[PDB]
Design a protein around this ligand. Structure first.
Ligand code: ZN
Lengths: 93, 59
RNA sequence: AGGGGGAACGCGGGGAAUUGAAACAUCUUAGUACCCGCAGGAAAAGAAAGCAAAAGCGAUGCCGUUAGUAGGGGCGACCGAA
RNA sequence: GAGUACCGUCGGUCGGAUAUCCGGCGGGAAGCUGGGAGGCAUCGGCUCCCAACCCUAAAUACGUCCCGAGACCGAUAGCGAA
RNA sequence: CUUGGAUCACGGGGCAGGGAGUUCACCCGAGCGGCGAGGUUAAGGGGGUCAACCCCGAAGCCGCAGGGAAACCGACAGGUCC
RNA sequence: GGGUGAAAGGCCAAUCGAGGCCGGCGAUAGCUGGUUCCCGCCGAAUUAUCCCCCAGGAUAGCCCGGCCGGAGGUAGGCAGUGGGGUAGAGCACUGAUUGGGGGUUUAGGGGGCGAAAGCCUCCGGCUCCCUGUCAAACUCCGAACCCACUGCCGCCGUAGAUGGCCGGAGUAGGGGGGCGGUGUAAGCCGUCACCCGAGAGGGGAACAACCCAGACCGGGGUUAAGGCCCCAAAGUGCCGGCUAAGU
RNA sequence: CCGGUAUGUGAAGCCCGGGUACAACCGGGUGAAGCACCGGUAAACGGCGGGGGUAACUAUAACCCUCUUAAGGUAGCGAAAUU
RNA sequence: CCGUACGGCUAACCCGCGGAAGCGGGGACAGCGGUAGGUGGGCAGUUUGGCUGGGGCGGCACACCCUCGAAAAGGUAUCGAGGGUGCCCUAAGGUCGGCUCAGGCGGGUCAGGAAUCCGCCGUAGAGUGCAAGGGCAAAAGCCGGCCUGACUGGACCCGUAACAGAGGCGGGUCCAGCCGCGAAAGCGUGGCCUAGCGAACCCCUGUGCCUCCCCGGUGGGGGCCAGGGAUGACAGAAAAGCUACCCUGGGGAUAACAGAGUCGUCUCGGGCGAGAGCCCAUAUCGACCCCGAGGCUUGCUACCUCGCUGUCGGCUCUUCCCAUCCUGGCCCUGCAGCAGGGGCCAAGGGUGGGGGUGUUCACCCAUUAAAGGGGAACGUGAGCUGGGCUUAGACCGUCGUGAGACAGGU
């Protein structure tokens, strides 16, 4: 499925219609400074059976996109609607 | 499970223990302490069968 | 000079599983049952390198509240002070 | 008042959570112009204290015994045992 | 028990004695009673004819103001109709 | 969870695929058994969704007790305003299905006068007329019947309707009878909501649910279902006809 | 199972850089065993199949190539305590 | 300046001789302590789902959409019938304008002509992004132009789930904001309508604000709103097997087992008449198609019994039925006689002995008047036997990594 690189849409910060660049969100790993990770690490210590579920082999064949739209005037980004599923995703002019 | 024979041998029971009380003594050389350079001499008195040596001993 | 004995109460160490979570592994049962050592008519604690917060208090122990609160926790079942 | 305060890592325990206490291992001070605490760590102020030695009654817990009492049972009951 | 018991479905030789919704903690309601924008004491103290009785003790808890994760903000004691 | 075993899971004080004694321990179980006086008022359910759920639970539905409120409600019927596509019927669409005629004559194999796809026929398709048949997943048609609403009749209701709040439950194996799908059938799965379950009495010879009929107590009468030769209360009843096989 | 090996991967620790008035934290490098790689071993566990075709008339595939796969049941025994 | 390995040494440490002092050998290795990775059924704790005409193998009726079932409002189940979805698309999305399809016939190309050219008829017999049903013609279809309303902040309502309760998920009617198309009115919150999807805790990203224990700063944490990362057993555990050494609690809610029901199958028959029989349907035989009885074979079902008895066969003992094998009496014949076929009445009496096999049955032998067949809880274990079958021991073959298993053999 083809998709444009730029689109004219409403900007909630400027409160008018402007041209927006389309970007995909890049995932990143768990931060060690976070409280959930602190708790996981302090419950993984010592003599203990594994304390949490461990789902291996859990991968939907098709995922929803996570798109962001960045304005050229204001420099800020937002999201536009919910995400839709499709295997192929090309950005074109 | 249950134990093996070689595991039961390690605990040291009569079923696995050597009857050394039946044997002639241990066979060892005289110590160097007494043989600094003295070169003692001896004479054989008797030849004897030992049940724990696979070889005959001499006194 | 010591050893041994003494119902319950006392001090210091070692330490489960049934069970509940409608299965179960973190958890719970539980610092529990049981085990080892050491004292007395009471033992232990005890005279701030503390608590607090623009005000101040003045060793320790016990009762009533604070409170099923702060907080912990497959943030589930539950646990739980000052 | 030194292998101490403190730093890191492992194990246990705690409501103690990046902020509970105990222990092992590796490092390791100042010491009166000195030192510590104030719930993540560091900086500056303000407040409060002086560890790493010792002793201490009363207010409390119990009842193998003793005294007194009872909307307790009344010999298949009441402690197993009148 | 069961859709279904006179059943070839289970329990049933006779008599007398024993024998099964109890206590605590929190919560939701009600039938009565006291005080009432306020209500109520706990531990404990004093007195006495000394476990009954009388007088103190409002610490705390609930209610009179709510909304909000929080910082924070902060309302008719009566205008009209059926 | 150790011993011993020329190995059989054999033996370890009548106890062994992990001894015996006491303790944890009044372990736990959605599974089985039991649960103590009388009368009186009311009175069910086994069906929807969810649960490692199917011998168990929760949320609703169906019962009971109390209160609020204050003027209507609707298990039946009549007339109307609208809705529907079943039974039946039929071929107007989709698909099937006999045969005889009138045509184009052909995409196409056998071909025949084919001096070679050929002009002519020829078995074949398609096109109108007859003729004979069909449909759970067809319809040019189309009931009885059911549903919603308005008005009226009827019935209930100020001795308190529709409704609302508070509280206490039980029910999560249903069965007979009628209808529908399935199945050789018996049976399986649903549906209606009359009965049994939870219902005495009078009859069918006896019969859970077929017929009459719903029950405080003591009495007197008339009928119902059915019956009237004896068993057995009541007719060896009346008129016309049939049967000769104890049918 | 055993042995060997250049490279690769590989935890803590150590080093370098960035960051933090210090730390927590981020990226890279090095990094033993083991894994990977290369070889030996069946009186180790185990395996010993497939076809597409047959020379002289009735049956023979008894001989020879093949492509599947590490290889393709040898001597003996056989309706067997195995049919 | 930091490391790593190689060589050597002795004084720590270790081993041996010793009554001890000391001697000899090894040696900064080992051993001991702390920490980090691997291997590890040697040892433990657990899990190994459900529906199901018993259970298992099989399948998914375990999440969704359409038609029939389904009974002309609504609602209605079965391992009921017929099928589909777990996507795709920057256009197949929005709007404006213009146009009209399939097929057939008549002309012209031509192997059918697959398609291009011409005219006419033609209510859709076409097409729609994809199943089925429904909708649609100056269109919702075809050809083109301009666009991104496939948007932000928010309300109310309907369905999943009637009546009668719901987290999450779909959908509908609108208010504001900023925009697109269009002359304008008007339409536009994805796809003509109905499928294409998912809790809590935790993490990632965006954006502007609140907050961290006496106060103020810095780094780093916690909070509110929005979008993504998954659980198909699809209202969401992190998860492999054997028991024939097996135990506990239950179940006739559920099999083997006899009984009840049923009779497809089984045993025994009938009707009609194609024919075969030298000719002649019917001495005898009798197709195809139709109608039955019995309950003695096997199946189907699951009403009865889960410690009633759970067994097959044989021996022994008694009794009944007739659909009659012999014995008594009759009829027809393709009955000369001797014998044979077929049928009627009759159940009084008879129906035996042996070989192999656990056998019933079937097969064979010699006799015989003939050596019939069934029922009685597949008659009969408080009558016998114990050969088979169906516990615990053991061997073979095959299957399995293995523990093991085999309506296979011993
Ligand atoms: Zn902008």
């Amino acid at each position: 499925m083809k998709y444009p690189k730029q689109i004219r849409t409403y900007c909630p910060f400027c409160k008018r219609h402007t041209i927006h660049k389309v970007e995909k969100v890049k995932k990143r790993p768990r931060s060690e400074l976070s409280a959930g990770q602190r708790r996981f690490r302090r419950k993984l210590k010592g003599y203990t059976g594994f304390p949490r579920p461990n789902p291996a082999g859990r991968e939907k064949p098709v995922k929803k996109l996570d798109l962001r739209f960045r304005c050229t005037v204001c420099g800020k980004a937002h999201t536009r609607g919910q995400g839709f599923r499709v295997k192929k995703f090309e950005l074109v002019e | 499970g249950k134990s093996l024979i070689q595991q039961r041998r390690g605990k040291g029971t009569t079923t696995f223990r050597a009857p050394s009380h039946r044997y002639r003594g241990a066979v060892r050389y005289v110590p160097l302490n007494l043989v600094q350079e003295r070169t003692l001499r001896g004479v054989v008195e008797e030849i004897l069968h030992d049940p724990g040596r696979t070889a005959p001993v001499a006194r």
